[PDB]
Amino acid sequence: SSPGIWQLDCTHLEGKVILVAVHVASGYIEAEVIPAETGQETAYFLLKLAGRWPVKTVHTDNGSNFTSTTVKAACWWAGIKQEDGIPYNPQSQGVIESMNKELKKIIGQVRDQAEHLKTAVQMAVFIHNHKRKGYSAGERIVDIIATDIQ
Amino acid sequence: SPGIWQLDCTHLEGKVILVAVHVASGYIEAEVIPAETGQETAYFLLKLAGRWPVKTVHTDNGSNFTSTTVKAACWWAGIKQEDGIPYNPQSQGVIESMNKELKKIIGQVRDQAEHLKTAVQMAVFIHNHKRKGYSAGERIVDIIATDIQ
């Protein structure tokens, strides 16, 4: 739960793959839709994330992305420590599952406003990150990193 | 102001790079698209406003200002869509200079990437991490955190 720690998470909907990065200390997320999880798609996603937030450590979502030399090359390029995603803390496992179920619920609530699933996913990222539960996740991430900069 | 962003559209390699700049910090997000359309612009803005507290966007030209798809995304995401008229002539200059900087960076990484979209994200990363002393990515976080408080 330090300011630079993120977790990758891969979930499926509509025959497609949604890749999510969660900032563990705040719950803030970024996500994209891809046709399948490949090391090239995961590597590109992490390059995007690391240009936008100070990403120090990523816990990868499975052993194939941990092994992937393309993912390791993006983590080398972007200065990221690539780690496994073993839930040595069993809470960690449960927190992901329940975020996937919340995101999927939100996606169902907006799904009919979008022709393409990628729109619906970005509307769900927007709702997730702005939801006050009290601060939002987007408020918590900014406060956490700003405190760290100071 | 903490919520104010400017869109900017530049061309390279027959493709289009759409950029959003956070005016007070110089921090940027960018993507490669085959051409600028109101549907691509709208989706890009939906992405941006889910990641940062986007209050106002100065659009990069009159077609995106007019586009009803862009206005529909700005409605959805709670964004005030404005024109991008440089009432302050400094605004023209700053954008031109950022396009020249980004293109320079992209040339410095271009051989490390097969696809232009990778080179553009490597350039976003270098731009946002560059210390000028704080980086743009540090400045944007400080500005918005100050505002949250």
Partner: peptide, 8 residues
Amino acid sequence: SLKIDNLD
């Protein structure tokens, strides 16, 4: 191909 995004 010797690229970050295409190691081949």
